[PDB]
C-alpha cells in the first residue's frame, strides 16, 4: 500500500529535487540575485513537497510494514518535515542560524597598526595564519578574530543551544548532541545494530591508542617551532594556538617547511613538472578518470565535462570557489572546482571525482536511499583516492615524477610527517571540539565556564594553550565555520579512521606487498569491485554491514591508521629519545 505511495513521491521528487540542485549550482557558478530568487523559490517548493509527503507517510505505521527496504525509506520522511518547534522559536532559530553564518562570512578585523587596513578571514587573516612567521602578526589575527566575531556570536550560540535542545528533546533525544550521534544509530538488523552511546565510547577508546603517536609529533613539532619562536615556546609546555598553520590549528600542514625531516632532500613538487609539461584542468580531471577506469569504474558522463566548472570563470561571472561534487539527478552530475595546476588540486580532483563515483554508484538505489552509509563514509571515499595518487609509484606511472628517484626512507619520513601534519593533528582537534559541544548539549558544562573548560580541554587533549586569557565574553568554539554554521564534526573523526580501514582492505585485495603508505590501487579490478559493492548500497544497509562487506570489520578500528604511520612513529620516538614528550597543562605564554 505505502509502496505505491513511495513510487509517486520518487517520481515527483526527482523533477522537483533536480530544479533545486540546478538553482543552487547556477547560483554557486553565477552569483546572481535572480539565481537566489529561483533557488529560494525552488527551495520553498521542495521544503513544501517534502513536508507535504511527511504527513502522508506519517499516515502509515512502520510496525505494519514487514518489507525492510521500504521501512528504511518510510523512516526518513516521517523522521523529517515536522517543525516540532514554536513558529516564534522556529523563526528565532533560523534567524540566529543565518545571523551567525553571516557574521562569520562578513566578519572583519582592523589592524590597530593600520586602523584603515582591515582583513576578512578569507583570505587576509587565513593568509597570515597559513604563511606568516611573526608571533605579534599571527597573534593579532587569531585574537582580533575572536575578540570581535566570536564575542558577538557568544549570545547567539547560548540561545542556539537552548532552541536546538528543545527541538531535539521534543523528539525524545536526550539533547542536540544525542540527535547528531543518531546519524550512526542502527536498530532492527541482528548483529549490525549500534547505540548513540557506543560512539562516545568507540571514539574515546580508539583515541587512547592515538594519544602516543600524537604525543611525539607534538614533541617534534615543538622541538622545531622552538628554532622559529625561541622566546615564545617552552620545551615542556603546550603549543601556543596561533602558531599552528591555521586560524584554529585544525591542521598543521602549513608547518611542513619548518618541520621537514630532511631538508635538502628531493622536495616533492610535481606542480613544477605539470607546468614544465604545460598541463591544464582537462589533464588533471582526465588523468584521474583513467585511474578510476583503471580500477574497473565507469567513465565520467559527457554532461560532467560539459556542465562542470573546473576553472574560475573570470570577472565576467563570479562563483563559490569551493571544490564540490554535485548529485543533481536525472543522471546529471557536476564538479565546481576553480582548478589550478598544483599537486594539491591534482589530488583534490580525484577526491571530488570519488564523491561523483559514489553518487553514480548509489544512483540506482531508491531516491531516499541515495546517500552515504553514514556522515564519514563519503569524505573517506575521496580521501583514499588522494592517498593512492600521492604514492611515488603513481607519480611515476603518471610521469610527473622521473623514474630516477630512489624511494629511500628519508623521503618516506618526509612523506609521512606531512601526511600526519594533516591527518593525525586534526584528531586531537576534531575529538576535543565535538566532545566540548557534546558536553555543552548534555549540559555537563555551565555557561559560566564554557571557555575555561574549552581551554582546559584544549590544553589537556590537544596540548595547545590560548596565548591570551579568554573571559566568558568570547565564543572561540564558534570562531570556526562548522560550529557557527551548525554542522556535526565527528564526520572528520570517523572518516579519518574509516579511510585507512578501506585502503588496507583494498590493497590486500590488490595483493600489494610492503608498507601501506606506498599502496597505489591503480589497476586493480578486485580492489574496485569490492569498493563498488559498498558504494552501490548507499544507505540501503547499515554502515556496520557495509564496512564489513569491504574491510571484514563491523566497527571502526585505528590499527590501519596506526600501521600507516608506524614507520614515522619509530622514527619520531627515536628522534625524541633525549627530548621530553607530553606537555605541562599549567604553562601558558602569559605565565
Amino acid at each position: 500500500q505505502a509502496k505505491t505511495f513511495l513510487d509517486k513521491f520518487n517520481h515527483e521528487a526527482e523533477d522537483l529535487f533536480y530544479q533545486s540542485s540546478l538553482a543552487s549550482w547556477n547560483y554557486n557558478t553565477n552569483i546572481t540575485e535572480e539565481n537566489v530568487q529561483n533557488m529560494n523559490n525552488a527551495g520553498d517548493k521542495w521544503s513544501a513537497f517534502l513536508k507535504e509527503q511527511s504527513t502522508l507517510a506519517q499516515m502509515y505505521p512502520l510496525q505494519e510494514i514487514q518489507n525492510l527496504t521500504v521501512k528504511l525509506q518510510l523512516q526518513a520522511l516521517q523522521q523529517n518535515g515536522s517543525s516540532v518547534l514554536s513558529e516564534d522559536k522556529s523563526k528565532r532559530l533560523n534567524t540566529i542560524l543565518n545571523t551567525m553564518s553571516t557574521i562569520y562570512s562578513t566578519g572583519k578585523v582592523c589592524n590597530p597598526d593600520n586602523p584603515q587596513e582591515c582583513l576578512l578571514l578569507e583570505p587576509g587573516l587565513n593568509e597570515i595564519m597559513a604563511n606568516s612567521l611573526d608571533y605579534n602578526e599571527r597573534l593579532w589575527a587569531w585574537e582580533s578574530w575572536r575578540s570581535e566575531v566570536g564575542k558577538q556570536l557568544r549570545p547567539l550560540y547560548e540561545e542556539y543551544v537552548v532552541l536546538k535542545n528543545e527541538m531535539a528533546r521534543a523528539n525524545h533525544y536526550e539533547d542536540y548532541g544525542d540527535y547528531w550521534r543518531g546519524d550512526y544509530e542502527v536498530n532492527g538488523v541482528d548483529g549490525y545494530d549500534y547505540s548513540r552511546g557506543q560512539l562516545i565510547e568507540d571514539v574515546e577508546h580508539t583515541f587512547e591508542e592515538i594519544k602516543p603517536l600524537y604525543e611525539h609529533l607534538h614533541a617534534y613539532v615543538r622541538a622545531k617551532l622552538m628554532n622559529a619562536y625561541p622566546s615564545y615556546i617552552s620545551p615542556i609546555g603546550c603549543l601556543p594556538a596561533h602558531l599552528l598553520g591555521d586560524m584554529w590549528g585544525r591542521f598543521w600542514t602549513n608547518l611542513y617547511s619548518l618541520t621537514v625531516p630532511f631538508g635538502q632532500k628531493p622536495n616533492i613538487d610535481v606542480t613544477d613538472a605539470m607546468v614544465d609539461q604545460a598541463w591544464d584542468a582537462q589533464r588533471i580531471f582526465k588523468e584521474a578518470e583513467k585511474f578510476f577506469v583503471s580500477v574497473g569504474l565507469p567513465n565520467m558522463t559527457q554532461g560532467f565535462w560539459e556542465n562542470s566548472m573546473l576553472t574560475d570563470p573570470g570577472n565576467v561571472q563570479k562563483a563559490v570557489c569551493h571544490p564540490t561534487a554535485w548529485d543533481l539527478g536525472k543522471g546529471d552530475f557536476r564538479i565546481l572546482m576553480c582548478t589550478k595546476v598544483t599537486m594539491d588540486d591534482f589530488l583534490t580532483a580525484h577526491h571530488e571525482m570519488g564523491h561523483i563515483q559514489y553518487d553514480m554508484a548509489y544512483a540506482a538505489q531508491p531516491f531516499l536511499l541515495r546517500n552515504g552509509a553514514n556522515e564519514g563514509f563519503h569524505e573517506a571515499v575521496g580521501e583514499i583516492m588522494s592517498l593512492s595518487a600521492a604514492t611515488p609509484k603513481h607519480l611515476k606511472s603518471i610521469g610527473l615524477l622521473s623514474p630516477d628517484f630512489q624511494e629511500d626512507n628519508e623521503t618516506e619520513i618526509n612523506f609521512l610527517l606531512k601526511q600526519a601534519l594533516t591527518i593525525v593533528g586534526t584528531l586531537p582537534f576534531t575529538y576535543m571540539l565535538e566532545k566540548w559541544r557534546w558536553m555543552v548539549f548534555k549540559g555537563e558544562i555551565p555557561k559560566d565556564q564554557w571557555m575555561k573548560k574549552w581551554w582546559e580541554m584544549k590544553r589537556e587533549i590537544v596540548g595547545v594553550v590560548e596565548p591570551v586569557p579568554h573571559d566568558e565574553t568570547y565564543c572561540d568554539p564558534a570562531s570556526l565555520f562548522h560550529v557557527s554554521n551548525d554542522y556535526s564534526f565527528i564526520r572528520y573523526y570517523t572518516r579519518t579512521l574509516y579511510q585507512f580501514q578501506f585502503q588496507e582492505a583494498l590493497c590486500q585485495a590488490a595483493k600489494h606487498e610492503g608498507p601501506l603508505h606506498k599502496c597505489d590501487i591503480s589497476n586493480s579490478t578486485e580492489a574496485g569491485q569490492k569498493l563498488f559493492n559498498m558504494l552501490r548500497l548507499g544507505k540501503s544497509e547499515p554502515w556496520t554491514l557495509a564496512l564489513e562487506n569491504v574491510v571484514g570489520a563491523k566497527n571502526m578500528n585505528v590499527r590501519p591508521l596506526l600501521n600507516y604511520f608506524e614507520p614515522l612513529f619509530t622514527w619520531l620516538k627515536d628522534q625524541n629519545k633525549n627530548s621530553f614528550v607530553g606537555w605541562s597543562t599549567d604553562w601558558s605564554p602569559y605565565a
Binding site: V36, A76, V320, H322, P323, T324, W326, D327, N485, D486
Partner: peptide, 17 residues
C-alpha cells in the same frame, strides 16, 4: 537534518539553498 544531499561540501548557512 535533510533527506538527500545534492552535493559533497558544507556551504555557509547564509545563501545555502
Amino acid at each position: 537534518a535533510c533527506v538527500r544531499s545534492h552535493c559533497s561540501s558544507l556551504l555557509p548557512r547564509i545563501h545555502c539553498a
